[PDB]
Amino acid sequence: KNEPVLDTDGDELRAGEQYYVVSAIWGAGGGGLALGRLTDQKCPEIVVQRRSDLDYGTPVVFYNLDTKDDIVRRSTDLNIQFVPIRDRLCLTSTVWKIDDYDTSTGKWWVTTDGVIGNPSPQTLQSWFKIEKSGNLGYKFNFCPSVCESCVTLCNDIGRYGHDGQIRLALGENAWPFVFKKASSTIKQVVN
Amino acid sequence: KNEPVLDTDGDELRAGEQYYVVSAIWGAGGGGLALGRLTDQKCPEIVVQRRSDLDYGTPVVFYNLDTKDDIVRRSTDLNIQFVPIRDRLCLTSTVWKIDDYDTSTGKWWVTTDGVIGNPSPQTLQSWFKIEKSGNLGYKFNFCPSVCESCVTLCNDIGRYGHDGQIRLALGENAWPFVFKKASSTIKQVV
Numbered sequence: 001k002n003e004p005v006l007d008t009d010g011d012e013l014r015a016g017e018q019y020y021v022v023s024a025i026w027g028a029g030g031g032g033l034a035l036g037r038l039t040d041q042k043c044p045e046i047v048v049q050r051r052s053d054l055d056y057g058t059p060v061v062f063y064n065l066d067t068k069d070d071i072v073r074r075s076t077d078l079n080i081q082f083v084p085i086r087d088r089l090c091l092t093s094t095v096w097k098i099d100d101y102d103t104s105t106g107k108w109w110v111t112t113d114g115v116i117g118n119p120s121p122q123t124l125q126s127w128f129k130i131e132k133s134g135n136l137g138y139k140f141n142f143c144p145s146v147c148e149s150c151v152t153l154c155n156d157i158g159r160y161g162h163d164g165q166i167r168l169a170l171g172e173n174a175w176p177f178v179f180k181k182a183s184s185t186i187k188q189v190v191n
Numbered sequence: 192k193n194e195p196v197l198d199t200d201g202d203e204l205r206a207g208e209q210y211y212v213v214s215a216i217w218g219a220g221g222g223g224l225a226l227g228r229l230t231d232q233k234c235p236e237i238v239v240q241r242r243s244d245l246d247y248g249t250p251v252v253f254y255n256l257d258t259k260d261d262i263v264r265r266s267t268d269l270n271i272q273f274v275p276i277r278d279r280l281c282l283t284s285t286v287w288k289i290d291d292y293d294t295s296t297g298k299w300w301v302t303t304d305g306v307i308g309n310p311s312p313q314t315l316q317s318w319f320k321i322e323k324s325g326n327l328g329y330k331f332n333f334c335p336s337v338c339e340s341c342v343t344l345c346n347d348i349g350r351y352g353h354d355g356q357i358r359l360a361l362g363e364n365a366w367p368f369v370f371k372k373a374s375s376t377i378k379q380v381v
């Protein structure tokens with residue numbers, strides 16, 4: 001029942017379709033999201049942002065909580081999965097999830113090896129919401145409500161430098177994004 | 192400066208002194224807290240509650256954020272450490288800390304191997320608060336203020352049965368406790 005998330009063409013986002021997640025702020029605001037690697041723990045791959053605003057990164061696909069709903073809506077728990085075109089460097093999943101607290105940095109990082117579906121305590125770390133960010137794009141929000149009796153973090157996602165890369169983590173200042181159709185989705189609006 | 196936490200004799204808690212942490216609800220509400228262990232895990236030890244209300248468990252000591260304050264006060268971050276009278280089972284610390292999320296239960300357990308002091312992002316999981324719980328004892332709360340920029344859990348601590356034992360975890364319904372001074376030795380000013 002919530003309002004649909006829109007892409008840069010003004011079209012409602014469709015579950016199951018590929019979208020680049022691109023910073024709503026260009027220049028020093030960077031480009032799109034992608035799979036990255038840390039040298040101390042190369043798998044699972046982490047979520048990073050490309051520094052070049054003309055690099056849209058790797059597309060993601062959204063999976064709704066209600067698998068019957070074709071539309072991606074604001075403020076509704078969903079799973080997010082990178083869909084790389086090239087061969088896998090890691091055998092962990094490319095599904096986003098919130099990591100365990102990192103004492104070395106004070107951060108709750110967005111990483112991968114998440115799980116699709118099965119809303120439950122077991123999958124709590126894999127559920128994200130998309131929220132409107134004022135009048136400038138959207139933000140990711142980790143505040144799952146799939147388990148009413150579970151204590152959870154409830155916080156927006158920002159971007160933070162670590163080891164020379166731009167990572168995503170829970171933080172006080174959300175980073176805004178827009179959604180751009182990947183080539184496979186552009187085919188869906190043309191005959 | 193917030194109001195002091197009081198023990199069962201009406202005396203303020205002092206840092207470094209040993210206190211049993213005993214359920215304010217007796218009978219089916221159980222007894223005091225103690226070090227325990229899991230089946231697959233001997234180390235670090237976990238925080239458990241004794242089922243018998245005349246078993247006060249293992250005493251704890253409190254460490255203040257500011258090492259100069261000797262009084263334990265409500266709604267202030269502190270470290271909590273078991274001081275067992277029995278041989279250690281582990282080389283890990285007996286300092287309380289919030290565990291990593293347990294996907295198999297949906298719980299954020301209170302465990303040990305925490306750290307004393309050094310309020311920082313590195314030690315964030317080791318800082319607890321004591322709050323009044325209405326007309327019946329005190330509750331523990333995990334909601335550290337030691338790192339203003341850090342994102343943190345912020346929740347009361349309840350008691351939950353798992354795998355035959357009574358554990359503590361973050362939860363919506365806090366469990367109430369009182370503090371019984373453990374030793375009959377002289378109350379010496381630090």
Ligand SMILES: [Zn+2]
Pocket residue numbers: 010011012
């Ligand atoms: Zn439309």
Ligand SMILES: [Zn+2]
Pocket residue numbers: 010011
């Ligand atoms: Zn249109």
Ligand SMILES: [Zn+2]
Pocket residue numbers: 040
């Ligand atoms: Zn290293």
Ligand SMILES: [Zn+2]
Pocket residue numbers: 050052055
């Ligand atoms: Zn590039």
Ligand SMILES: [Zn+2]
Pocket residue numbers: 066068069
């Ligand atoms: Zn439906």
Ligand SMILES: [Zn+2]
Pocket residue numbers: 099100111
């Ligand atoms: Zn991890």
Ligand SMILES: [Zn+2]
Pocket residue numbers: 102103104105
């Ligand atoms: Zn680290």
Ligand SMILES: [Zn+2]
Pocket residue numbers: 038040162163
């Ligand atoms: Zn690193």
Ligand SMILES: [Zn+2]
Pocket residue numbers: 192193
């Ligand atoms: Zn105050």
Ligand SMILES: [Zn+2]
Pocket residue numbers: 194
């Ligand atoms: Zn008063």
Ligand SMILES: [Zn+2]
Pocket residue numbers: 202203
């Ligand atoms: Zn006194």
Ligand SMILES: [Zn+2]
Pocket residue numbers: 201202203
């Ligand atoms: Zn007094």
Ligand SMILES: [Zn+2]
Pocket residue numbers: 257259260
């Ligand atoms: Zn002072």
Ligand SMILES: [Zn+2]
Pocket residue numbers: 282283284304
């Ligand atoms: Zn240790």
Ligand SMILES: [Zn+2]
Pocket residue numbers: 290291302
């Ligand atoms: Zn642990």
Ligand SMILES: [Zn+2]
Pocket residue numbers: none
């Ligand atoms: Zn750890």
